[PDB]
């Protein structure tokens, strides 16, 4: 059994070239065979190819045959996956897995094409545009009183660049009836995302409320307290 | 060059209940389809191979029938641990061109509860910083089929607006939607009414959401 | 009459390339060959990936006829021993049937001698030299793919004293003889392999070769069936798709043996002989022996 | 007859190149005429040597007419006279193998004593040359000395030995602890 550990997000403009990585341990690396299984934000899982450890044969799938590129090193059993040509298309999370085989001095090997084993996931967004703190505009209060009697307010995180943006309220404190919406990207190449939380409206003044806004990408975490109306 | 599809784009199945998606290919797999379980941001979870074969540690619910060109993945027992997308990838080839379906998504059934709609104004922080963003917000609705439109003052909008929903809410099985208005400071001051419209079963007639200025 | 044959030809490099280019166009696999270096990033290693098929490899009796203006000459001499002036020899039109059968340490399915066990080496006496032995009777390797062959504990034991009354110190007067198995190397050369019923065996052979000489007891063997392999053709390696069927059965008849001897103990007392095979020529040699090309005019 | 020199635990590779032949057969044996290595076709073949678990050849370059004799983790055992018997050309070798290891550990105090003891093959009287890291040297054939370290004489020293007009160079570290008044 064993365990995939892959390398940390990357960001790519398009034309580039990126490698990543995928630490395989806890079972003689030789007697598996990995394959890498890319997926794109809101699509579904795509096969991009699968190298047969024991011999260093690859087969890649028919479309990204030429720019795509699988290596293992036995000594250090790790797996790679070179991308050239980085299209912007190509911004998706990149999964190494594997199943075993049997090999290792046996000539033993069923060449099982499923995948038993998978990684974290790297995320790989290749854009133009550049890494950047988003800007945490507050969602005032509509009014008091609302549909039902439960006042709902939040933030509006809009303009950052890579994707992974983490929200909280009350440092963690409140957690109940919060919504943090997944993120869109917007035409100008920067994501926007809004996080809410409904509350009733009697609480609104004497309990305030906070927005905790992190992005590692650019270093950036902002507090915005979400003023009553 | 195997072309896989699982019929049933989205399954809506009462917790508890038995559930059955459908995997066909355009060319014979010959037993060589394997099913996978995929939670929000997490890696796939291998379920079966081999076409009716289960891998360790998956419960005798989920069962795997079918060769050829269709096969089905069958989940008595619903429980909760069983929200997910479901794939099947066919692996019958050489050399290896492998493929997969597009998935069924296995969503929650339960009552139809119409959305609680909420609309906000560009924050003055925004309109000083320079644009303007409306913000309506579908509050806690059942089906995920929910309709939203906007106003400018009374003129329909359209393009300028960017919605997104919620994965499943795992205490009420209900989801919520956020749909953003963008104009910039400019167009913003010039008009006055700016309305968010919604529809959905649950919600009798249309719900209007709007303010002005 | 009166003619010369021996360790050299007729058909041994013809046949072997009959054989692999036979192999070829039947049992497809997964290729993969080293061609050596030069330098500055550019260095090949041909892989290639064909559809590899599941199909079964059956042996054809192959005829070798007189090529061209040449003629065979069959030495008739019912003992022939390799290298040497044969005295009953005569023209032939083709040889025999010949079954080209591909395996390690066991000659099977083959041309069994008609008087005694015969012997026969390029040189004795360099112990890096294989040894090839023809039979006088047959014996029985019936094998299934469920990981075994088994043949009969009595039949073999005898044919082992038959061949111990002649190893290396030539029809030896007498000493030890001593059977052990093989001191290493490839899987192919470690084992009995062969390819059965398509399949490729590696039956583990210690029980046939460690021994000691001067009511339904059946020698059982642990066989396997590799998918990896390493090429008899030529330095490659190869694979294979895995099995199919759930009833792979093989019955060969062990027609000879291929076997080399221990040194550092040339003339002494006793003598050890391992099982040998690796080179498929070897195998060709042991049918081909009694003839040879002349030219015709 | 060449001569080739090697250290105890690496791995050495003797030479043989087929008179201008490809990949043909081939076999590497010692002075008793015990089969160490061969092939048979196209697969390998291992004898009843002492080698035989540490013995090995390079398949790649059989078809270049190259077919080497790769002998890991040498052994001081291992010094004996390798023929290499392609179609009739026994080209010869003499493998000796060496070992150099310093008595006195590592971690040693300024003032103390270091030695290195020559582990050498049965037959064979080099020569040897230490320097250490502040050029100090010594020389001898066995057993070589230094009465009082210095704390100059922390780091990796190199031992060069000489047999048959060859050498190996052995580099060793050697701790010389530091001290205050
Ligand atoms: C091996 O099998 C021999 C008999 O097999 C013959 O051929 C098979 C295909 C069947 O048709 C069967 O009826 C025939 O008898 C035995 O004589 C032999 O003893 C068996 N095993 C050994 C170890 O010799
Ligand atoms: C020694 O050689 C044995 C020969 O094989 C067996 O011989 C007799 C005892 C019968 O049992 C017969 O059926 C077998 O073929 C091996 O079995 C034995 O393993 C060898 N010795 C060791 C220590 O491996
Ligand atoms: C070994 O080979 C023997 C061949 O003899 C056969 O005898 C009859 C059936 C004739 O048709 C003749 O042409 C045959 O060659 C077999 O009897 C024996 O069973 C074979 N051994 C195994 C294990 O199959
Ligand atoms: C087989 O051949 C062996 C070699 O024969 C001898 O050497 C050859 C070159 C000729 O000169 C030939 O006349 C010699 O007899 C013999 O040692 C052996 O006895 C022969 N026959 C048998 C049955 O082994
Ligand atoms: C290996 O590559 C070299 C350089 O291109 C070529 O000359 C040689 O013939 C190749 N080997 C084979 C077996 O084709
Ligand atoms: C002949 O030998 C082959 C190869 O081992 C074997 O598969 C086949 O069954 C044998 N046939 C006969 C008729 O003995
Ligand atoms: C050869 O086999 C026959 C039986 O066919 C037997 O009488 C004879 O002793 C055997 N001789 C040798 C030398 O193997
Ligand atoms: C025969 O073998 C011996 C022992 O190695 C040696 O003379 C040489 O290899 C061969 N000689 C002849 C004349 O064939
Ligand atoms: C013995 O013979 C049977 C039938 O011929 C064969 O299937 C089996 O593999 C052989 N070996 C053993 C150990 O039964
Ligand atoms: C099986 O093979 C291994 C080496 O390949 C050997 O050590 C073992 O003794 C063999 N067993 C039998 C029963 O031949
Ligand atoms: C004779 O007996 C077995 C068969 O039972 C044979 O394989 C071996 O070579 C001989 N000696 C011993 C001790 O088995």
Redo the contacts between chains.
């Keep these: 059994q064993v365990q995939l550990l892959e390398s940390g997000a990357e960001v790519k403009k398009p034309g580039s070239s990126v490698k990543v990585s995928c630490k395989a341990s806890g079972d003689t690396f030789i007697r598996y065979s990995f394959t890498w299984v890319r997926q794109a934000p809101g699509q579904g899982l795509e096969w991009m190819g699968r190298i047969i450890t024991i011999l260093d044969v690859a087969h890649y799938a028919p479309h990204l045959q030429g720019r795509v590129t699988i290596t293992a090193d036995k000594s250090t059993s790790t797996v790679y996956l070179e991308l050239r040509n980085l299209r912007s298309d190509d911004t998706a999370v990149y999964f190494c897995a594997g199943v075993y085989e049997g090999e290792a001095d046996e000539g033993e090997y069923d060449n099982n094409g499923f995948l038993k084993h998978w990684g974290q996931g790297t995320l790989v967004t290749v854009t133009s545009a550049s890494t950047k703190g988003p800007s945490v505009f507050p969602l005032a209060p509509s009014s008091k009183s609302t549909s039902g009697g439960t006042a709902a307010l939040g933030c509006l995180v809009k303009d950052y660049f890579p994707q992974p943006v983490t929200v909280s309220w009350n440092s963690g404190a409140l957690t109940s009836g919060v919504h943090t919406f997944p993120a869109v990207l917007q035409s100008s190449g920067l994501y926007s995302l809004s996080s809410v939380v409904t509350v009733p409206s009697s609480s609104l003044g004497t309990q305030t409320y906070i927005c905790n806004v992190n992005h590692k990408p650019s270093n950036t975490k902002v507090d915005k307290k979400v003023e009553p109306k | 060059?195997l072309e896989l599809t699982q019929s049933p784009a989205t399954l809506s199945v009462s917790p508890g209940e038995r559930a059955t998606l459908s995997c066909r290919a355009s060319e014979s797999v010959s037993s060589?389809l394997?099913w996978?379980q995929?939670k929000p941001?997490q890696?796939?979870?291998?379920l079966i191979?081999?076409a009716s074969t289960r891998?360790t540690g998956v419960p005798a619910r989920f069962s795997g029938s079918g060769s050829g060109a269709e096969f089905t993945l069958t989940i008595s027992s619903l429980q909760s641990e069983d929200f997910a997308?479901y794939?099947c990838?066919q692996?019958?080839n050489?050399?290896?061109?492998?493929?997969?379906?597009?998935?069924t998504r296995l969503e929650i059934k339960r009552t139809v509860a119409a959305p609680?709609?909420?609309?906000?104004?560009p924050?003055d922080?925004?309109l000083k910083?320079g644009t303007a963003?409306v913000?309506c917000?579908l509050?806690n609705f059942y089906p995920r089929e929910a309709k939203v439109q906007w106003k400018v003052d009374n003129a329909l909008q359209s393009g300028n607006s960017?919605?997104?929903?919620?994965?499943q809410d795992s205490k009420d099985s209900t989801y919520?939607?956020?749909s953003?208005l963008?104009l910039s400071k400019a167009d913003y001051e010039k008009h006055k009414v700016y309305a968010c419209e919604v529809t959905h079963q649950g919600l009798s007639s249309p719900v209007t959401?709007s303010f002005n200025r | 009459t009166e003619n010369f044959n021996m360790w050299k030809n007729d058909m041994v490099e013809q046949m072997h390339e009959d054989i692999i280019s036979l192999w070829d166009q039947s049992l497809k696999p997964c290729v993969k060959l080293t061609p050596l270096c030069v330098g500055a990033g550019s260095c090949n290693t041909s892989v290639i990936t064909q559809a590899c098929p599941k199909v079964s490899f059956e042996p054809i009796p192959i005829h070798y006829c007189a090529p061209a203006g040449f003629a065979i000459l069959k030495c008739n001499n019912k003992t022939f021993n390799g290298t040497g002036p044969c005295t009953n020899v005569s023209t032939v039109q083709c040889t025999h049937g010949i079954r080209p059968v591909v395996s390690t340490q066991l000659l099977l399915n083959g041309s069994l001698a008609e008087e005694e066990v015969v012997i026969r080496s390029v040189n004795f006496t360099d112990n890096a030299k294989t040894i090839i032995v023809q039979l006088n009777t047959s014996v029985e390797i019936n094998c299934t793919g469920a990981g075994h062959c088994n043949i009969s504990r009595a039949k073999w034991n005898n044919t082992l004293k038959q061949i111990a009354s002649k190893l290396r110190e030539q029809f030896g007067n007498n000493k030890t003889i001593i059977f052990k198995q093989s001191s290493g190397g490839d899987p192919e050369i470690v084992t009995h392999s062969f390819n059965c019923g398509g399949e490729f065996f590696y039956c583990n052979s210690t029980q046939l070769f460690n021994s000691t000489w001067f009511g339904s007891d059946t020698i059982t063997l642990p066989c396997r069936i590799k998918q990896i392999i390493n090429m008899w053709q030529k330095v490659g390696k190869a694979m294979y798709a895995p099995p199919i069927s759930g009833q792979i059965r093989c019955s060969s008849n062990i027609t000879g043996l291929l076997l080399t001897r221990d040194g550092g103990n040339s003339n002494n007392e006793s003598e050890i002989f391992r099982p040998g095979g690796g080179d498929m020529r070897d195998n060709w040699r042991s049918e081909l022996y009694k003839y040879k090309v002349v030219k015709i005019e | 007859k060449k001569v080739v020199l090697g250290k105890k635990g690496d791995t050495v590779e003797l030479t043989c190149t087929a008179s201008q032949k490809k990949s043909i057969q081939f076999h590497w044996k010692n002075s008793n005429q015990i089969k160490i290595l061969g092939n048979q076709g196209s697969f390998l073949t291992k004898g009843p040597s002492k080698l035989n678990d540490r013995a090995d050849s390079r398949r790649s370059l059989w078809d270049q007419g190259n077919f080497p004799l790769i002998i890991k983790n040498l052994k001081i055992e291992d010094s004996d006279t390798y023929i290499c018997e392609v179609e009739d050309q026994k080209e010869e070798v003499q493998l000796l193998v060496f070992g150099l290891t310093a008595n006195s550990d590592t971690h040693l105090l300024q003032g103390q004593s270091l030695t290195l003891t020559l582990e050498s093959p049965p037959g064979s009287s080099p020569s040897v040359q230490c320097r250490s890291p502040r050029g100090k040297n010594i020389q001898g054939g066995k057993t070589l000395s230094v009465s009082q370290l210095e704390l100059q004489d922390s780091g990796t020293w190199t031992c060069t030995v000489l047999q048959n007009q060859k050498k190996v160079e052995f580099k060793i570290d050697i701790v010389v602890l530091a001290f205050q008044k």
């Design positions: 060059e060589d394997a996978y995929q941001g890696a796939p979870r291998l191979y081999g891998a997308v794939y990838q692996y019958n050489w050399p290896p061109r492998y493929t997969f379906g597009q998935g609680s709609v909420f609309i906000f104004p924050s922080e925004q910083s963003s913000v917000l509050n960017q919605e997104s929903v919620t994965e919520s939607l956020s953003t963008t959401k």
